[PDB]
Design a protein around this ligand. Sequence first.
Ligand SMILES: CCCCCCCCCCCCCCCCCC(=O)OC[C@H](COP(=O)([O-])OCC[N+](C)(C)C)OC(=O)CCCCCCCCCCCCCCCCC
Ligand SMILES: CCCCCCCCCCCCCCCCCC(=O)OC[C@H](COP(=O)([O-])OCC[N+](C)(C)C)OC(=O)CCCCCCCCCCCCCCCCC
Ligand SMILES: *Cc1cc2c(cc1C)nc1c(=O)[nH]c(=O)nc-1n2C[C@H](O)[C@H](O)[C@H](O)COP(=O)(O)OP(=O)(O)OC[C@H]1O[C@@H](n2cnc3c(N)ncnc32)[C@H](O)[C@@H]1O
Ligand SMILES: COC1=C(OC)C(=O)C(CC=C(C)C)=C(C)C1=O
Ligand code: SF4
Ligand code: F3S
Ligand code: FES
Ligand SMILES: [K+]
Lengths: 48, 86, 604, 82, 164, 259
Amino acid sequence: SYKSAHQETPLTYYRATQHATSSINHRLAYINAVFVIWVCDSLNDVDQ
Amino acid sequence: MLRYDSLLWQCTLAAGIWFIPQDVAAISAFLLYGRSKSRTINQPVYVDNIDTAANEYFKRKGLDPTKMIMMRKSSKITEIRYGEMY
Amino acid sequence: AAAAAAGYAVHDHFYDAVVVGAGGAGLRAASGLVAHGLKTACISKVFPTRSHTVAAQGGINAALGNMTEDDWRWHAYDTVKGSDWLGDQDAIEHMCRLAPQVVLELESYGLPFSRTKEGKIYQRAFGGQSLKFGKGGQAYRCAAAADRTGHAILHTLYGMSLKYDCLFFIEYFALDLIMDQDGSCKGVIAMSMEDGSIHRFGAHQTVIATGGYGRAYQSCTSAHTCTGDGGGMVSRAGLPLQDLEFVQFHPTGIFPAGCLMTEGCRGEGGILRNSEGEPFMARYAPTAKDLASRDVVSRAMTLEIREGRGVGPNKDHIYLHLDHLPAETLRERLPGISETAKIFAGVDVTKEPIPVLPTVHYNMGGIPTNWKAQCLNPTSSDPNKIVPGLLAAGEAGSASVHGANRLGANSLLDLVVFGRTAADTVAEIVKPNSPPVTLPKDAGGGTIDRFDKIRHAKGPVSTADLRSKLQRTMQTRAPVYRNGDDLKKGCEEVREIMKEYKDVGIKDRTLVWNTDLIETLELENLITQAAQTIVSGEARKESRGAHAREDFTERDDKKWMKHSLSYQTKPHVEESDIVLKYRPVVDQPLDSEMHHVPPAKRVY
Amino acid sequence: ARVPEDIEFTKNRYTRRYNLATEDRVKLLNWNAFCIAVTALPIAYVYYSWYESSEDTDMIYRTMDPMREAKADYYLPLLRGH
Amino acid sequence: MLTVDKFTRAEALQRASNLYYQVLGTNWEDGLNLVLDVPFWESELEKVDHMCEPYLCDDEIGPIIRNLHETVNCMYACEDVRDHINELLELSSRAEGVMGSGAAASEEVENMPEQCGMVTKAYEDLLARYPEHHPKIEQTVGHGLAVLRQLEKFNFKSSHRYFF
Amino acid sequence: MQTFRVYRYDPLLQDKPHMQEFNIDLAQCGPMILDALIKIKATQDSTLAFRRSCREGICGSCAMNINGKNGLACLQYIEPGAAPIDIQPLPHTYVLKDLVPDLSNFYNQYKSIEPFLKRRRAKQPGEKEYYQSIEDREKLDGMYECNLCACCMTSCPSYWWNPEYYLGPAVLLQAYRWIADSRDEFTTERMAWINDSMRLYRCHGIMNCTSCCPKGLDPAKAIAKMKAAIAAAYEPGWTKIVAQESIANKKRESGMMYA
Ligand SMILES: CCCCCCCCCCCCCCCCCC(=O)OC[C@H](COP(=O)([O-])OCC[N+](C)(C)C)OC(=O)CCCCCCCCCCCCCCCCC
Ligand SMILES: CCCCCCCCCCCCCCCCCC(=O)OC[C@H](COP(=O)([O-])OCC[N+](C)(C)C)OC(=O)CCCCCCCCCCCCCCCCC
Ligand SMILES: *Cc1cc2c(cc1C)nc1c(=O)[nH]c(=O)nc-1n2C[C@H](O)[C@H](O)[C@H](O)COP(=O)(O)OP(=O)(O)OC[C@H]1O[C@@H](n2cnc3c(N)ncnc32)[C@H](O)[C@@H]1O
Ligand SMILES: COC1=C(OC)C(=O)C(CC=C(C)C)=C(C)C1=O
Ligand code: SF4
Ligand code: F3S
Ligand code: FES
Ligand SMILES: [K+]
């Protein structure tokens, strides 16, 4: 008759530290490099 | 639920401040390398009067002025084309 | 299992032993029973590591002899003097003779004790401890682990219980005992605060290892969970409670927070000063100025503030100066005090004095017990008669090792020793494998009915208001220095608060983590014990240990060297009276290894 | 939603139910098979790729350096750019 | 098995004991451990069986083979139950919705009280079938049932030993 | 007159959790957050539920999320301001009722590391305390003070995502405490068991555990040390060591254990 609740994602409210934002920028480093390569490839193909 | 000091909003601004500058430079370098090649292959050359230039071209290349459709592509761009091109 | 009593889902368990409490005393008893091969359960309101034992700071007393030469017999003499010749010398010998072994066992399970230069356990000076039966000097018997000796013990005893694989029923609030018609405990009846189900644990031998009832006063060092639930259960079973008038006020408690500053602070050089800047403690207890018995120090502090030599803008407290001591020693030996002061008082220990005031800390009273931790139901002919199936351990129990005043660093020792003894005593009674107990036919009926009556309570007064009223009366009518007139006034007031529990009302009617209901059930336990305390104190016309009557300022060994037994007439707190009987104190030691310490003056 | 209520769970290594753990092992094999196949792309580039300016290069070697031993006088400015 | 390789009894004993402890030591709860390792374990187990066939009655090799077979049986059986539990918990998580908001939420298991009665029965059946592998059964299936207990309030025998 | 929004959930109605706003006069309330919650319960809404025992920060029972960051209510200070003080349960935990989290998984994971001293030889009769130097005891300084508040646990983004596979900061620090205790003789066994991709290497060094620790401990530093020690000391035979210990626990009761 009783059920527990599941709290939402903590990302929306948990306080952010400078070490946590910078750790993400490190884990996203390779993701940006691929993105830039794709942009340059697209530009070399659809521009000038 | 939503907060400015949230891990999401502070990790999205940090990423933007950190990557957007790097990226703008990176893409710009590619754009610069593109211009270096383009300006060495077909540098834009400005002529005064299009009609006189077209005549000198037809004369220099031995092209019959009647078979060449000259069209104005833009306010600052004209373009001679073959009218009998398949 | 599955049954349905008065519409409630009742599960039935059938163990060989049940331990109510997962504090120091309860964790030790459980590990011991499991180690003896007996099927056992350990019920607790909180995760075992959150019990009040974790807040202990000083240490445990053992005649290890790591700092100086020592004898357990010397520790035993100190305890007798500290008890003001109200504690049983039989139980004191058993505890002191086992203190070395118990402490080493705790180290063997990984207790991170502080160490000496030779790799042995460091021992600190504490109040009321001497050498050579008082003819020597300060004794360094308190094996401490920095300012966190409780956290260490409780965590280590939990680890030991995990190693032995003890069945734990965590977040289960025990309601009553399943007593038999003959008069034998057959188990406990508890509720789960996480599921809302009632469980009827049926055991051959039950161990009540709850804590004290220190939250019955406005200002205490006790936890909010310290409501004395096992004493109420015993009182509602018709069994006696003992020495409830002897409530210990710790000399140093942060003002007004009510937090505790370890006695080790003074035991490492700390000095208490007044408005005149005097170490006044030399006038009272001159030989051991600040390291006197906790009852002497507290009375001295109260008289000083009363005389007008108090510190502060309101001249209401006393100052504890640890600033003169080395900063390294403060950081190494008193690591926890410093932070707590910085927060709850805003004091820098190394540069400023700490505001302190005597505060209720421990309760020497509890369930009457023998030296084997078997609860007693004394009769006029058999003062040592024991309840057939019940045992007690810890602050909840009163084996009278501590008598009228507890010596610092002896309670944590009583947790380990008597928890171990309780497990040994059950092993002899209950065999490792035994036919299951036969829970009586109407087991829990009354408890379920009362729980339902309280669950659906819609009266005018609120639990919080009633609790504040009780806390106020206890704080004002039973202070450090008690007078007979106030004790009488208060005794009338607590009786009114008893009949006012019939008007309490709760707003939450759920069963899953209904703190409102749980707190009202706790208030019943708090009221009955607080009532018995005031009644017993007013009845004692002497001044022994923590009980200091201004009307009668002298010990009466001739007519008051007795244990005071209180009884609740009826199971309902709003339908009962507090009757008082007495039982004699055991003065002869259990063996000849120790001698009888004759009653004498307690000057300190 | 709802979920089946009469599942015959695996009892031993020779009486096995098909579950998503076995499907994940097939995925491991199929992904690894792709890796073996995609290795043919980089290996084919290295084998078939030729870096030559014109068709002249081979004619020069056939008529001037057939044994790959003929020595050419070196004028540094030619390839030094200055 | 089709092979021309020949191995001594000492080599056969070594290979079988290596595989037995390798399987019994690997963490079964982590799914990627079993998914990645089982292909290598199955190739090795076929070779071990071929070379240990003469020594099935041997006093040293024989017991190793019997324990190895039992461990593999328990490994497959436990993995199956925890796989279903993982399915139930992932159905529950998807029901929460995107960001926990409930925005794009999947429909939520309706026979969850009954799906928890099925798993607990399976857990007890494993305990009886594999009495000498309780530590592994508790690592995988026992802990799995403890996670489910945090979502649905159900009763199983070892619930109290999992702090419920 | 500060405003305190508090998370509220009834386990029976099972209605969507909501934040209710209360107004409290800080003049008649204690400085700490826990005092405000007690005052609200005593005066306005007695239904409010929350865990609290020690009042001095030592029990580790009042762990909550205050204005975004985890902490113990008894040590947290009320910060008056126009902005309501938001109090919620511990992040990404199952809420049993109002602010009371469900930390059963945390308790089980701790039991898994077997936090009790292990020695190969049983204390010989006539033996005193096991020798440990002051320097050795100093190694266990910042690790033995953990009160199990579970803030560092419910602040790690890696425990949010994989709660049932990652041991979490608090358990991992406790494992290092027993791997660093000179008296323990099962150093290799403990390191071998903890050397798992999910158990240990899910820590990405976010450092939220160290930032929110109420006791001022550094779980992040301990996990880094434990990873370095394992990497240097790994041997091919570790897997067999884990298996042999698992055989030793064959007759243990039903609960989390080394396996
Ligand atoms: C387990 C087997 C896996 C096989 C998977 C499938 C094939 C993988 C192939 C791997 C190599 C690929 C190299 C790059 C692509 C080459 C393409 C190419 O140009 O090929 C022609 C060329 C030949 O040159 P070529 O000039 O004649 O042809 C190329 C033509 N042009 C120049 C126009 C591009 O191949 C090579 O040059 C590659 C030679 C590789 C030699 C490797 C030697 C390995 C030695 C290992 C010793 C180990 C000892 C162990 C002892 C243990 C004792 C206990
Ligand atoms: C025997 C001793 C051993 C010593 C070992 C020491 C090794 C370490 C030293 C570095 C060696 C590597 C040199 C680079 C390769 C040769 C350069 C080349 O081909 O360029 C000439 C080519 C020459 O082409 P060219 O057509 O212009 O040449 C004709 C020149 N004129 C016109 C004057 C006649 O340069 C270019 O084409 C222009 C683009 C060059 C871009 C170079 C980018 C750098 C590449 C290396 C990256 C390294 C990454 C690691 C560092 C991390 C950085 C964040
Ligand atoms: C309060 C205090 C006491 C103290 C101390 C410091 C403080 C602030 N320092 C000490 C020291 O340095 N040296 C020493 O020798 N003693 C010291 N003390 C004394 C000691 O810590 C206390 O007396 C302690 O309470 C004794 O331990 P005990 O095991 O008897 O009790 P507990 O730790 O309070 O835990 C009791 C358990 O019972 C459970 N419980 C309570 N009611 C119920 C119900 N109704 N149902 C089920 N379980 C119940 C509690 O949850 C707890 O687990
Ligand atoms: C509560 O809702 C969500 C999860 O469940 C815990 C996620 O796993 C995660 C984490 C996954 C990624 C890809 C960061 C997110 C973002 C999410 O919204
Ligand atoms: S490491 Fe800190 S936050 Fe984590 S449980 Fe221990 S005291 Fe609490
Ligand atoms: S926040 Fe988590 S990722 Fe590591 S550094 Fe702390 S345990
Ligand atoms: S109430 Fe104990 S940590 Fe706050
Ligand atoms: K070690």
